[PDB]
Ligand binder design. Structure first.
Ligand SMILES: CC(C)CCC[C@@H](C)[C@H]1CC[C@H]2[C@@H]3CC=C4C[C@@H](O)CC[C@]4(C)[C@H]3CC[C@]12C
Ligand SMILES: CC(C)CCC[C@@H](C)[C@H]1CC[C@H]2[C@@H]3CC=C4C[C@@H](O)CC[C@]4(C)[C@H]3CC[C@]12C
Ligand SMILES: CC(C)CCC[C@@H](C)[C@H]1CC[C@H]2[C@@H]3CC=C4C[C@@H](O)CC[C@]4(C)[C@H]3CC[C@]12C
Ligand SMILES: CC(C)CCC[C@@H](C)[C@H]1CC[C@H]2[C@@H]3CC=C4C[C@@H](O)CC[C@]4(C)[C@H]3CC[C@]12C
Ligand SMILES: CC(C)CCC[C@@H](C)[C@H]1CC[C@H]2[C@@H]3CC=C4C[C@@H](O)CC[C@]4(C)[C@H]3CC[C@]12C
Ligand SMILES: CN1CCN2c3ccccc3Cc3ccccc3[C@H]2C1
Lengths: 264, 217, 50, 333
């Protein structure tokens, strides 16, 4: 009874994610008005979400449904490494979109010159470079794919580099944007309410989706406590559904994106 | 496939495309201002301060390139060419204060402002309002009260309160207060802070557009 | 002023029956329908636009 | 005096009513309709970065000219999409352009009140401003060529002009319009031309001698486009009241009205097919409608433009229809 419902909900989640990412990619590519560096960053985030939805979620489902895992002791390492890379690259796109917005609202005059496709390409290249650098170190060192918290030094390095550093960066860069918007509002109610609500929706989703997984990782990797497989799986998929949430946050609040969706 | 002439044609097309992209990138950073006013509003003095048919005035302030389009010489129908300025960054309106009691360009200025800021093309375009010739207004108000143009005006015949009332009525002519904002400034017969105010309004509009791209506005 | 003489010159023109004008219009359309690529879709072999 | 004008207008209306023995719709009732007309975007010319306000095809049915708010005309090769020329404009506000019948020159005009002529076939290769034609006191709505030496021009001065490019000054001024003239259409023999204005009237003028031959009314709003029938004895006018009309020169009155309840939007461009059976009217509802000129039935719809279809043109050979819109793309069907 439970297994069929779990399989159905996981498969509908992983298909909704890929359809949403494909819709965002097609809307950005097709529309000539949506050819901006910020939209290029959003498109890169969408393709990263597509990658983590078509290369990570399907493999996670078969682990969950078919109790054990039978694909070899080699492909498990590849799946885990690509999962690290994709789920860190999504976070770092969420961070560089925050950087781009902070520079666009704060230094509006100067950043207009610098908002070139070259800058967006360099941003995405350094995002992927960071993601690779937080996924390759564990490679130089069945019936199950258990995360190996063998080296403590890598546990802190991986968890700070992938989540906590982007967490602090996003918090700072959106608090500063909130004050920048507040300064505009105060010098001339509902606008402040909308500005607070949108930032809350952007930040709280990124918190509630990823923070529990990395806090349990910090607990387990330090040999503090132990967590059951079901709770770990639940928090893992709570992290995964950020791939679903991200297009909704980063496209549904833009008038040009809404118009492109209506046209499509 | 393609011969030598065809390849040369494609090369020429690619070079022209490169030139068009470079020109578009250069021109996308320029701030478009549409200067409007009455017959004797004083826009010519403002143009002289900062710097046939439509008159283009190109100037630079703090690394920003402003192009101001004056269409005061177009006596034809306004609705047949106004949409050409649909994408201007701002509309610099000029109102001559001292023309408040002259038989009635103040009412004509109010009517034209109402027609402009409520135009369907300029729903999201901000208006920078200038109240020119306030120095002459301060001495004209003493001999002639503001009641001639605005009978509903109440209070002392002080130039400060009169200017406040005129400003407030101009922002009351707006019906899109939730979308656009009207920046009001007094010329004060100097150019430095005048261009500074224009630049500040332009930067505010640019920041508003950047915040609206993210949905935060 | 000049309007009255201009309108007199306009009114002093020759006139034709509407039926004859419509018949001539139809005759031209039906005579040149064969040479109209838009009316009759030309085959893509002879269409310079692909 | 002012009293006799009304009497003569009533006399003209009575004469027109007497001449209206039948109607065009009741005569073309028995002829077979063309049916649905399907057109696909054969080419999509890209390269403009702002709203496009005018275009004109070449005589050879291959090259064309397009004008946008970029402040630069573009001479395209429609067959291969290659940009043959990109002529920068001194004034970025252009709302009319014309491609010379011989292909040597290209004219453009706008809020600068000047229909500047550029020479395309110059010795040095790079296009140069051959002539700057000044003398109009209003925004320039349409200036169309006659030959390499003469041009006709329509402005917001409520008047038209006939310029000699070599001399550089007007040789004939056509006055009589009450509103801004916004459209021109040269007769196929280039002897007369019709001009539609904002006073909801289209006047047929004689080029050689000057005086207004005829005046046609019937529109309820400003006329934004006009075009002769290929026979040269009729013309179609598109206005802001969402109705096109087909007036006849010889009959001196309208023959058919092309309108629908669904369309409530003005017409920005009107053009005919080679045989005259189709009437392609570009609407500012972001599309175009192909009407049966003998039935007033909408034979087809041309959609694909995101913004208002500002300009429309049909080649001399009738092979393709090119529509330019405010989304900065031309589409050749
Ligand atoms: C499914 C296969 C083809 C892989 C798809 C992923 C990659 C190759 C795709 C996804 C998004 C795509 C981009 C989407 C939009 C644009 C802008 C356009 O002006 C040029 C092409 C360009 C830059 C596309 C290039 C190819 C692209 C980067
Ligand atoms: C390593 C791969 C899989 C990462 C995902 C694809 C990346 C490289 C793609 C996705 C969207 C792409 C960009 C979309 C649009 C443009 C603008 C164009 O004028 C130059 C290319 C450029 C800048 C593209 C290339 C780089 C880009 C960011
Ligand atoms: C490259 C990708 C897109 C291929 C398709 C991936 C997804 C849709 C596929 C791959 C393997 C599939 C699983 C294979 C076996 C089972 C066990 C069965 O009792 C329920 C369905 C379930 C759990 C399948 C669900 C769908 C699944 C996860
Ligand atoms: C691999 C992991 C552990 C480290 C990756 C490198 C990190 C620490 C680097 C790479 C790029 C860096 C950013 C580059 C530019 C800016 C803009 C400005 O606001 C200064 C800080 C900030 C925001 C930097 C913060 C630190 C940063 C994010
Ligand atoms: C859909 C959202 C919540 C993301 C989480 C998806 C996955 C991880 C969720 C969705 C349904 C969940 C299951 C629902 C019910 C039960 C029965 C309970 O006795 C043990 C946990 C267990 C077996 C859950 C495990 C986690 C689970 C499989
Ligand atoms: C859920 N999935 C993505 C998130 N996660 C991350 C991400 C960044 C840094 C460390 C880890 C922890 C880890 C260790 C070993 C394999 C895979 C991970 C992946 C597992």
């Amino acid at each position: 009874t439970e297994k069929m419902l779990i399989c159905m909900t996981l498969v509908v989640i992983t298909t909704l994610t890929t359809l949403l990412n494909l819709a965002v990619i097609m809307a950005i590519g097709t529309t000539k008005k949506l050819h901006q560096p910020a939209n290029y960053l959003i498109c890169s985030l969408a393709v990263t979400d597509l990658l983590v939805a078509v290369l990570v979620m399907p493999l996670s489902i078969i682990y969950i449904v078919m109790d054990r895992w039978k694909l070899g002791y080699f492909l498990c390492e590849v799946w885990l490494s690509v999962d690290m890379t994709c789920c860190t690259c999504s976070i770092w796109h969420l961070c560089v979109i925050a950087l781009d917005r902070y520079w666009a609202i704060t230094n509006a005059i100067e950043y207009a010159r610098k908002r070139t496709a070259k800058r967006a390409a360099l941003m995405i290249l350094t995002v992927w470079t960071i993601s690779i650098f937080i996924s390759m170190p564990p490679l130089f060192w069945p019936s199950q794919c258990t995360i190996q918290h063998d080296h403590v030094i890598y546990t802190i390095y991986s968890t700070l580099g992938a989540f906590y550093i982007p967490l602090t960066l996003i918090l700072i860069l959106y608090y500063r944007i909130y004050h920048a918007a507040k300064s505009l509002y105060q010098k001339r109610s509902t606008r402040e309410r909308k500005a607070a609500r949108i930032l809350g929706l952007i930040l709280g989703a990124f918190i509630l989706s990823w923070l529990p997984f990395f806090i349990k990782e910090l607990i387990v990797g330090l040999s503090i406590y132990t967590v059951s497989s079901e709770v770990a799986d639940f928090l893992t998929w709570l992290g995964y559904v950020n791939s679903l949430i991200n297009p909704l946050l980063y496209t549904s609040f833009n008038e040009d994106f809404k118009l492109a969706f209506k046209k499509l | 496939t393609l011969s030598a002439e065809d390849k040369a044609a494609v090369e020429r097309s690619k070079m022209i495309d490169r030139n068009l992209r470079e020109d578009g990138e250069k021109a996308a950073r320029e701030v478009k201002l549409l200067l409007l006013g009455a017959g004797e509003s004083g826009k010519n003095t403002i143009v002289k301060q900062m710097k046939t048919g439509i008159v283009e005035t190109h100037f630079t302030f703090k690394d920003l390139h402003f192009k101001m389009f004056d269409v005061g010489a177009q006596r034809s129908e306004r609705k047949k060419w106004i949409h050409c300025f649909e994408g201007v960054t701002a509309i610099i309106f000029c109102v001559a204060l001292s023309d408040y009691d002259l038989v009635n360009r103040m009412h004509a200025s109010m009517k034209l402002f109402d027609s402009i800021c409520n135009n369907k093309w300029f729903t999201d375009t901000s208006i920078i309002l200038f109240l020119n010739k306030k120095d002459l207004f301060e001495e004209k108000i003493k001999k002639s009260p503001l009641t001639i143009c605005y009978p509903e005006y109440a209070g002392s015949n002080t130039y400060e309160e009169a200017a406040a009332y005129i400003q407030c009525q101009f922002e009351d002519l707006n019906k899109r207060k939730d979308t656009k904002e009207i920046y009001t400034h007094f010329t004060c017969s100097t150019d430095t802070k005048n261009v500074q105010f224009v630049f500040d309004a332009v930067t505010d509009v640019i920041i508003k557009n950047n915040l609206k791209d993210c949905g935060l506005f | 002023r000049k309007l009255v003489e201009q309108l007199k010159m306009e009114a002093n023109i020759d006139r034709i029956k509407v039926s004859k004008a419509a018949a001539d219009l139809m005759a031209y359309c039906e005579a040149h329908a064969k040479e109209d690529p838009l009316l009759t879709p030309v085959p893509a072999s002879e269409n310079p636009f692909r | 005096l002012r009293q006799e004008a009304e009497q003569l207008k009533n006399q003209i209306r009575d004469a027109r009513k007497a001449c209206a023995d039948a109607t065009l719709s009741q005569i073309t009732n028995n002829i077979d309709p063309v049916g649905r007309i399907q057109m696909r975007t054969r080419r999509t010319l890209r390269g403009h970065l702002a709203k496009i306000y005018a275009m004109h095809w070449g005589t050879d049915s291959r090259l064309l000219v397009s004008a946008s708010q970029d402040g630069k005309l573009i001479i395209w090769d429609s067959y291969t999409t290659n940009k043959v020329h990109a002529i920068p404009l001194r004034s970025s506000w252009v709302m009319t352009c014309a491609y010379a019948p011989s292909g040597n020159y290209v004219a453009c005009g706008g809020l600068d009140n000047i229909c500047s002529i550029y020479n395309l076939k110059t010795r040095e290769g790079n296009v140069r401003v051959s002539r700057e034609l000044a003398g109009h006191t209003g925004y320039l709505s349409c200036c169309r060529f006659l030959d390499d030496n003469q041009i006709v021009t329509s402005s917001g001065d409520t008047t038209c002009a006939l310029w000699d490019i070599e001399t550089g000054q007007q040789t004939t001024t056509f006055t009589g319009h009450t509103g801004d003239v916004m459209s021109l259409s040269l007769a196929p023999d280039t002897r007369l031309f019709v001009s539609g204005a904002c006073d909801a009237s289209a006047k047929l003028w004689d080029v050689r001698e000057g005086m207004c031959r005829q005046t046609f009314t019937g529109h309820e709003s400003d006329i934004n486009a006009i075009c002769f029938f290929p026979n040269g004895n009729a013309f179609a006018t598109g206005s802001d009241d969402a109705t096109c009309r087909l007036f006849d020169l010889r009959a001196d009155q309208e023959l058919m009205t092309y309108s629908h309840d669904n369309i409530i939007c003005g017409i920005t461009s009107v053009s005919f097919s080679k045989s005259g059976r189709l009437l392609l009217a570009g609407y500012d509802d972001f599309n175009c409608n192909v009407w049966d000129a003998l039935k007033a039935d909408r034979a087809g719809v041309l959609a694909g433009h995101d913004n208002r279809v500002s300009c429309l043109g049909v080649t001399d050979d009738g092979m393709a229809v090119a529509t330019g819109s405010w989304d900065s793309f031309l589409k050749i069907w």
